[PDB]
Design an enzyme around this catalytic site. Sequence first.
Site, PDB file in Angstrom:
ATOM      1  N   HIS A 150      12.864   3.240   1.345  1.00 48.15           N
ATOM      2  CA  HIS A 150      13.767   2.130   1.225  1.00 48.15           C
ATOM      3  C   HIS A 150      13.445   1.238   0.023  1.00 48.15           C
ATOM      4  O   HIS A 150      14.244   0.354  -0.274  1.00 48.15           O
ATOM      5  CB  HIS A 150      13.616   1.264   2.501  1.00 48.15           C
ATOM      6  CG  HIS A 150      14.883   0.643   3.012  1.00 48.15           C
ATOM      7  ND1 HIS A 150      16.104   1.237   2.917  1.00 48.15           N
ATOM      8  CD2 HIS A 150      15.089  -0.478   3.755  1.00 48.15           C
ATOM      9  CE1 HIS A 150      17.013   0.503   3.527  1.00 48.15           C
ATOM     10  NE2 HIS A 150      16.439  -0.545   4.048  1.00 48.15           N
ATOM     11  N   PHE A 152      13.078 -10.657   2.620  1.00 53.34           N
ATOM     12  CA  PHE A 152      13.348  -9.512   3.525  1.00 53.34           C
ATOM     13  C   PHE A 152      14.527  -8.677   2.950  1.00 53.34           C
ATOM     14  O   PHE A 152      15.497  -9.213   2.383  1.00 53.34           O
ATOM     15  CB  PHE A 152      13.706  -9.991   4.920  1.00 53.34           C
ATOM     16  CG  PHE A 152      12.618 -10.648   5.652  1.00 53.34           C
ATOM     17  CD1 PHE A 152      11.454  -9.973   5.974  1.00 53.34           C
ATOM     18  CD2 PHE A 152      12.744 -11.945   6.050  1.00 53.34           C
ATOM     19  CE1 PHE A 152      10.440 -10.569   6.722  1.00 53.34           C
ATOM     20  CE2 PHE A 152      11.730 -12.581   6.754  1.00 53.34           C
ATOM     21  CZ  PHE A 152      10.539 -11.864   7.074  1.00 53.34           C
ATOM     22  N   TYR A 158       0.807  -1.251   0.000  1.00 53.84           N
ATOM     23  CA  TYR A 158       0.000   0.000   0.000  1.00 53.84           C
ATOM     24  C   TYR A 158       0.829   1.284   0.000  1.00 53.84           C
ATOM     25  O   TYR A 158       0.248   2.382  -0.071  1.00 53.84           O
ATOM     26  CB  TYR A 158      -0.937   0.011   1.240  1.00 53.84           C
ATOM     27  CG  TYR A 158      -1.034  -1.380   1.752  1.00 53.84           C
ATOM     28  CD1 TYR A 158      -1.474  -2.395   0.904  1.00 53.84           C
ATOM     29  CD2 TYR A 158      -0.590  -1.722   3.007  1.00 53.84           C
ATOM     30  CE1 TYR A 158      -1.502  -3.703   1.301  1.00 53.84           C
ATOM     31  CE2 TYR A 158      -0.612  -3.049   3.419  1.00 53.84           C
ATOM     32  CZ  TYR A 158      -1.063  -4.033   2.558  1.00 53.84           C
ATOM     33  OH  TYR A 158      -1.100  -5.352   2.881  1.00 53.84           O
ATOM     34  N   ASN A 160      17.196  -7.573   4.330  1.00 56.56           N
ATOM     35  CA  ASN A 160      18.478  -8.071   4.791  1.00 56.56           C
ATOM     36  C   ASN A 160      18.842  -9.428   4.289  1.00 56.56           C
ATOM     37  O   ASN A 160      19.899  -9.973   4.634  1.00 56.56           O
ATOM     38  CB  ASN A 160      18.497  -8.122   6.325  1.00 56.56           C
ATOM     39  CG  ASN A 160      17.785  -9.308   6.882  1.00 56.56           C
ATOM     40  OD1 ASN A 160      16.653  -9.571   6.563  1.00 56.56           O
ATOM     41  ND2 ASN A 160      18.407  -9.968   7.761  1.00 56.56           N
TER      42      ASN A 160
END
Lengths: 196, 196
Positions: B23, B69, B18, B71
């Site tokens: 980032h 993710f 959304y 990372n």
Amino acid sequence: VSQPIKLLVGLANPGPEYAKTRHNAGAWVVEELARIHNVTLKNEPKFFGLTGRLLINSQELRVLIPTTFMNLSGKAIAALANFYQIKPEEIMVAHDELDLPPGVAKFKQGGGHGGHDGLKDTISKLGNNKEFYRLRLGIGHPGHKDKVAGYVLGKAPAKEQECLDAAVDESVRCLEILMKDGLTKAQNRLHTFKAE
Amino acid sequence: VSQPIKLLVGLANPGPEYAKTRHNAGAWVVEELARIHNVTLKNEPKFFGLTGRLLINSQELRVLIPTTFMNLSGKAIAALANFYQIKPEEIMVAHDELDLPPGVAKFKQGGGHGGHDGLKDTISKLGNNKEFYRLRLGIGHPGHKDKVAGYVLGKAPAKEQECLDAAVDESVRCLEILMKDGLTKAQNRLHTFKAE
């Protein structure tokens, strides 16, 4: 009553865009516990998160919600636990749990990270000590493993969110019972709860 | 030698769906380059992300947006780069850059991760090798270390986002120029750009 927990952590990503995502379920518990106890959490940069001390039944329980990336949760947890002289076995980390359905929650001691980026970092920063307690808030899981990160970073549909909210509230009640009657009685109660 | 790049990666978290958060800036570049070139990005679970292939001036350019993710972005990148035998110096990673303002963007080879969890994982999973290229999309720096995660996981205000989107557009043009004329010329254009 003797009970093991000196620190309750609720895992989260920070900011408004992540606040209602499944992967913030553990923070939901800590936020509701603190609200019921009338304590506003204070930002403490040295702990990379928001903290408070609750008086419940009337044990002292410190609480923490990290404001790090989820994958750096351990920086917060270690920094706070070291400052307050708390050992891993005296920490309960609340987190979303893929292996339980929405509307269920469980207490556990130990275990793997289950691919949860916050639990992974926590284990690492606590010196590879897995023997902290967990409050596992069920969120369900997607059909395919590669979709897990998108899943946990999504918002649950309204019906599912009702189940999650119910399990959050009952987890709060059982934390209050943990501080009055101890872990076995708290666990006996929590592990019979299923929202649906 | 003057056009080293076989893989363009755009970093992003895979939800919530959304939310255009800072980032995810690198993925915006890959999405727009793909749109203009009529490439449909398709889920490819063995590379843990969305993939495509472009041909620009007869040079094959594979594109990736990890759906790990953040990372774990290097897991996707290394999976794909290993499958196609692409070296780290042949990879360009588009990413949000705290060290440039909104509306500015730059190409560079090597460097640290600067606290970017995706870049950190990328260096690690490429066998501790910093010498991949970067497309640095400026997002500004909040002026304090404490809420950096909250800042990059935030939505830029509407005006600032216009500056970002403008830098995305220019970055797409300079990626096209890189594939035609090589890296030095692509830099000469991109590095003098500021959104107006």
